[PDB]
Amino acid sequence: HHPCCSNPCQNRGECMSTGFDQYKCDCTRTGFYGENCTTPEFLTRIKLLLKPTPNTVHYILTHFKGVWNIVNNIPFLRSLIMKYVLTSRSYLIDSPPTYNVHYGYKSWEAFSNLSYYTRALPPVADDCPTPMGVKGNKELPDSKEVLEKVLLRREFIPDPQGSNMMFAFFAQHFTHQFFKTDHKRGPGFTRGLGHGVDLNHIYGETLDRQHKLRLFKDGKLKYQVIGGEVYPPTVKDTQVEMIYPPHIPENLQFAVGQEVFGLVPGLMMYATIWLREHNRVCDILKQEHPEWGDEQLFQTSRLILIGETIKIVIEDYVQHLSGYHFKLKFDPELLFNQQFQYQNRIASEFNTLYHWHPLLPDTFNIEDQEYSFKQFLYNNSILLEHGLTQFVESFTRQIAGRVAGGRNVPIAVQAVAKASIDQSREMKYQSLNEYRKRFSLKPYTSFEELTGEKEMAAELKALYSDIDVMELYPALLVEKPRPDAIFGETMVELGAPFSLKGLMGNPICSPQYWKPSTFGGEVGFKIINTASIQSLICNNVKGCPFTSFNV
């Protein structure tokens, strides 16, 4: 079997087999040397003694309101802090990308084939003695048992940060432009070849789909008016394929950019908001540019909406998640004096960690209805009976579930949580502790240390034996969360790098693009640079309801 199964190489050094039973580590630019890249260079030891731990930096950012209010208001100083956040996170990601499910060594196939999700760590080799490498038993614990003992929800657990349903559905809507697993092929594959924020969930992945949804007048997307209100067009009308079950009335089969968004009214809400937003921007642009044709109006709006999305994600969405008193900034300019790759590749592990189903409540509370999952799923008529305004008002009020901390995955979606484990396993994911090391974190030394608690840790011990064979997905959902927070440490420390690179790594953030001319002048550039979750809802939802990502 493979020499590198034990994952002997430390500190991001590369393991390469040298014989049938021997291996060599490659310690190039790791700042370490010796057989396993475990001995630090001199300047490395100074830099490690100094560099503070992530839980420390987190505390700092979530305390001392006073000091931050000073910082938040000195532009130079805020820019500098944001610049540190962006760069330190960034250089934790391989870019251009390296590994995938089929390639544990770098290769032209792995690089050039955009069908694969990339991989943060190589897969465990097809022939290691144990699933996780060398440690633990011949088989991993049964996945249903892992699910039931520590993932499934007993009483619903509210998010202490107060994330609402507006947040949850925004998260789902947003991430599903670049988490589009190609199930024909397998879990390691993707239909999202844009590999990032290209708004293909609004505009469509292929050109054939885009052209089927476009109106071809003033840049606008096709739509329909029902009860005086703007909604997406139908499958029948556009010829755009959508996943709907047979029993659905043809006029409630809305056709949007992403074929799965019919499944959930929460998604279809955002689909509609974003369709309205596009056409609003075409309207603004048609006024500033009477000379432009349909094509440029469409193209330009899309770039404006990309910018808006990135802005809202950073300054509202990520902001809300962070819990920081520091105010994050979307300013491409902060990277212009930096080594940064304006490219992205969606990593499988990023997809895994973003399975935030604990957010989902037991029932959906719109107006004074309470809808079971069975009631909610597919029922686009709920979105019409109540209308967008009541949706926004109710979803802003209803609280989401806590993700970390264990035992909060809704029973209605248990099959989904199971599949995340089973697919982790098919894709030969490395262990929790390997990922922690990969992103510069002390490996958990015991289950009690991981959960911060005795009861679930005991259950996990009798399922896994060794903390070092604990799997990544279940770990994320049971981890002791930061104090009064939604996530544990691993979730943030893996997630933030992928997230920021997904956002900042967009071509529109590049110097040659980040100019007002790209967005049709001062006006367009201004739309992007003052966008917010609130302005998005306000401009496009009748009555301009107040919204935020928290109750």
Ligand X SMILES: CS(=O)(=O)Nc1ccc([N+](=O)[O-])cc1OC1CCCCC1
Ligand Y SMILES: *[C@@H]1O[C@H](CO)[C@@H](O)[C@H](O)[C@H]1NC(C)=O
Ligand Z SMILES: CCCCCCCCO[C@@H]1O[C@H](CO)[C@@H](O)[C@H](O)[C@H]1O
Ligand U SMILES: *[C@@H]1O[C@H](CO)[C@@H](O[C@@H]2O[C@H](CO)[C@@H](O)[C@H](O)[C@H]2NC(C)=O)[C@H](O)[C@H]1NC(C)=O
Ligand V SMILES: *[C@@H]1O[C@H](CO)[C@@H](O[C@@H]2O[C@H](CO)[C@@H](O[C@@H]3O[C@H](CO)[C@@H](O)[C@H](O)[C@@H]3O)[C@H](O)[C@H]2NC(C)=O)[C@H](O)[C@H]1NC(C)=O
Ligand W SMILES: *[C@@H]1O[C@H](CO)[C@@H](O[C@H]2O[C@H](CO)[C@@H](O)[C@H](O)[C@H]2NC(C)=O)[C@H](O)[C@H]1NC(C)=O
* Given the residues 231, 244, 317, 354, the one annotated as active site: 354
Question: Which residues, 417 to 436, sit near ligand HEM by CB under 6 A?
Answer: 419
Count of positions on this chain that bind ligand Z (CB under 6 A): 6
User: Is 173 among the residues that bind ligand X (CB under 6 A)?
Assistant: no
Residue 385 touches which member of ligand Y, ligand W, ligand Z, none, C-beta under 5-8 Å by kind:
ligand Y
User: Is 504 among the residues that bind ligand X (CB under 6 A)?
Assistant: no
Q: Which amino acid is at 365?
A: N
User: Is 289 among the residues that bind a second copy (CB under 8 A)?
Assistant: yes
DSSP string spanning 297-320? Answer: HHHHHHHHHHHHHHHHIIIIIIHH
Rounded CA-CA distance 301/287 in Å is 13
CB of 492 to ligand X, least distance (A): 4
Which of 382, 427, 477, 527 is the binder for ligand Y (CB under 6 A)?
382
What lies within 8 Å, CB to CB, of 497 at 6+ separation is 89, 90, 92, 93, 439
Tokens 């960690």 correspond to what residue? Answer: 353
User: Is 381 among the residues that bind ligand Y (CB under 6 A)?
Assistant: yes
Question: Which residues, 315 to 374, sit near ligand X by CB under 6 A?
Answer: 318, 321-323, 328
* CB distance 465 to 477 below 8 Å: no
Task: Classify burial at 251, counting beta carbons within 10 Å of its beta carbon; exposed 0-12, middle 13-18, buried 19 or more.
Answer: middle
357 annotated among ligand-binding-site residues: yes
Segment interacting with ligand Y (CB under 6 A) among 37-45, 156-164, 229-237, 378-386: 378-386
CB of 538 to ligand Y, least distance (A): 26
* CB distance 343 to 94 below 8 Å: no
Q: CA nearest 509: which of 519, 494, 495, 521?
A: 519
Residue 505 touches which member of ligand HEM, ligand W, ligand X, none, C-beta under 5-8 Å by kind:
none
Rounded CA-CA distance 366/381 in Å is 13
* Given the residues 102, 176, 201, 355, the one annotated as active site: 176
User: Is 154 among the residues that bind ligand Z (CB under 6 A)?
Assistant: yes
- Rg value, the chain, Cα: 24
Residue 239 touches which member of ligand W, ligand Z, ligand U, none, C-beta under 5-8 Å by kind:
none
* CB distance 399 to 454 below 8 Å: no
Rounded CA-CA distance 311/316 in Å is 8
SS (H, E, C) 490-543: HHHHHHHHHHHHHHHCCHHHCCCCCCHHHHCCHHHHHHHHCCCHHHHHHHHCCC
User: Is 452 among the residues that bind ligand W (CB under 6 A)?
Assistant: no
Q: Which amino acid is at 263?
A: L
Classify 231 in phi/psi space as left (phi over 0), alpha (psi -120 to 50) or beta: beta
User: Is 363 among the residues that bind a second copy (CB under 8 A)?
Assistant: no
Does residue 176 have an active-site annotation? yes
**Residue 21 corresponds to which tokens in the numbers above?**
């039973």
Residue 172 touches which member of ligand V, ligand HEM, a second copy, none, C-beta under 5-8 Å by kind:
ligand HEM
User: Is 388 among the residues that bind ligand Y (CB under 6 A)?
Assistant: no
324 annotated among ligand-binding-site residues: yes
User: Is 40 among the residues that bind ligand W (CB under 6 A)?
Assistant: no
User: Is 185 among the residues that bind ligand V (CB under 6 A)?
Assistant: yes
Q: CA nearest 318: which of 85, 124, 129, 157?
A: 85
* Angle of helix 75-90 versus helix 65-73 axis, rounded to 10: 100
Q: Contact letters (x/-) for ligand U, 152-191, by CB under 6 A?
A: ---------------------------------x------
Residue 149 touches which member of ligand Z, ligand U, ligand X, none, C-beta under 5-8 Å by kind:
ligand Z
Rounded CA-CA distance 303/401 in Å is 34
User: Is 207 among the residues that bind ligand V (CB under 6 A)?
Assistant: yes
Residue 487 touches which member of ligand Z, ligand X, a second copy, none, C-beta under 5-8 Å by kind:
ligand X
Which of 120, 202, 235, 264 is the binder for ligand HEM (CB under 6 A)?
264
- Buried b / exposed e over 338-363, threshold 16 CB at 10 Å, is eebebebbbbbbbbbbbbbbbbbbeb
429 annotated among ligand-binding-site residues: no
User: Is 206 among the residues that bind ligand V (CB under 6 A)?
Assistant: yes
Q: Contact letters (x/-) for ligand U, 199-238, by CB under 6 A?
A: -------xxx------------------------------
User: Which chain residues interact with a second copy by CB under 8 A?
Assistant: 3, 14-20, 24, 26, 28-29, 94-96, 98, 103, 105-109, 111-113, 194, 198, 207, 288-292, 296, 299-300, 302-303, 306, 337-343, 507, 510-513, 515-518, 520-521
User: Which chain residues interact with ligand W by CB under 6 A?
Assistant: 6, 8, 35-36, 38
Would you list which residues are annotated within the binding site for substrate? Answer: 89, 324
Active-site residues, by number, are 176, 354
Would you list which residues are annotated within the binding site? Answer: 89, 324, 357
